[PDB]
Curated annotation (Swiss-Prot), chains A, B:
Post-translational modification: Ubiquitinated. Ubiquitination by RFFL induces proteasomal degradation and indirectly regulates p53/TP53 activation.
One MF term in the entry's GO annotations: cadherin binding
Transmembrane segments: none
Site label Interaction with phosphoserine on interacting protein, positions: R61, R132
Keyword check for DNA repair: no
UniProt source species: Homo sapiens (Human)
Protein name as it appears in the record: 14-3-3 protein sigma
Subunit record text: Homodimer. Interacts with KRT17 and SAMSN1. Found in a complex with XPO7, EIF4A1, ARHGAP1, VPS26A, VPS29 and VPS35. Interacts with GAB2. Interacts with SRPK2. Interacts with COPS6. Interacts with COP1; this interaction leads to proteasomal degradation. Interacts with the 'Thr-369' phosphorylated form of DAPK2. Interacts with PI4KB. Interacts with SLITRK1. Interacts with LRRK2; this interaction is dependent on LRRK2 phosphorylation.
């Protein structure tokens, strides 16, 4: 690899520099490099991983949306030229590229039957999310196999978290938020989306007295609310 | 090239899409492709060129600054590790890469003894600016040769513009602003910086009654003011 001859600790340091310079591509390559060393990431390191990929794939999903949308206008009685589909396709391909990279890392290095339950859940949720990102652009039988892959990752995460985390823990909250958005927006399951977000909001309300140590929990709870709004 | 088999008109279109998706790298590759077709750019096309490169080199100069600055803190009684110099060097190399690309295009395709005076000035100013960007990171005799290159491009631009453009024209204004900043910040010539910005502000004030058709002219005039502030 291009990062194979660099010390793990130096890779983490350069990830942190790249974040500060706002170089998410770089930040992401440095973190991939660190992961490939074959050692468990800490909590701080896993966040550095997801923040980096999150931003990279983030810019791509947003450019895709801009382009898909321009490609629907131009699909409504003008006028012509394939350029916009062509470019939309170029961008789609990059995005599939990055998701396969992330899914590769998760499957090759991070997802294990061992470790903390908080980390097991963290990675399985990330698997869920990267499949979901693939599902947003995929078609046909391909789309079908991805949806199932997202579902299995998210479900297994849910089993682990419902058993081993308080209902207020923001990983478990983020996970259930993401899963419910998957049911609604990807899997065509508004019934399942709604009862998940409901169960999840309710069970956390019942405990709001305990989490006083973050109100990172509360932003997600508003998102759950902001969501049950449009879905009902 | 990667753009060699694409139609010129399609390249322009995809530049415009890349701008809207905020993909300046892409936008820049598409415009380089269009330039390589060997045809004069219009006014609209030249702007598409500089907006694209401007943004690419812009993000790099800003990451460089973040890193150079962190590299001075860490150069003041802690602590150690070469990582920050290493990364700063990686980023510097990318930036030199893009400037050489732009200077190549200008020299190979755009700078001509023929055409509009507005275009001749536009490209020579751009040459000035890309050398100046190189000067900001260069050292030693290399730095010396670059400074002279910037100077000659900016000077020749000035000769053309002082003769063939009204004192209020925002290209001539942007050019003199940039040249004066070069004298101050790159060439260690505060005397020359000040008298240029002065002459340039004054001569435009004397004509402010004519430009009523943009007040793009006026923002630059404030910049000239905002500058004569710190320099005196």
């Amino acid at each position: 690899g291009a990062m194979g001859s660099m010390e793990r600790a130096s890779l983490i340091q350069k990830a942190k520099l790249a974040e500060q310079a706002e170089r998410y591509e770089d930040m992401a390559a440095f973190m991939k490099g660190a992961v490939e060393k074959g050692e468990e990431l800490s909590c701080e390191e896993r966040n550095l991983l997801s923040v980096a990929y999150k931003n990279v794939v983030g810019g791509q999903r947003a450019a895709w949306r801009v382009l898909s949308s321009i490609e629907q206008k131009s699909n409504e009685e003008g006028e012509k030229g394939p350029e916009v589909r062509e470019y939309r396709e170029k961008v789609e391909t990059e995005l599939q590229g990055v998701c396969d990279t992330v899914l590769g890392l998760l499957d090759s290095h991070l997802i294990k039957e061992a470790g903390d339950a908080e980390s097991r859940v963290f990675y399985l949720k990330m698997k869920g999310d990267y499949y979901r990102y693939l599902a947003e652009v995929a078609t046909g039988d391909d789309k079908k196999r991805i949806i199932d892959s997202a579902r299995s990752a998210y479900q297994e995460a849910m089993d682990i978290s419902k058993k081993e985390m308080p209902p207020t823990n923001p990983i478990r909250l983020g996970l259930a938020l993401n899963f419910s958005v998957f049911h609604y927006e990807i899997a065509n399951s508004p019934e399942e989306a709604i009862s998940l977000a409901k169960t999840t909001f309710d069970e956390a309300m019942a405990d709001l007295h305990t989490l006083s140590s973050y109100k990172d929990s509360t932003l997600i709870m508003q998102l759950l609310r902001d969501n049950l709004t449009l879905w009902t």
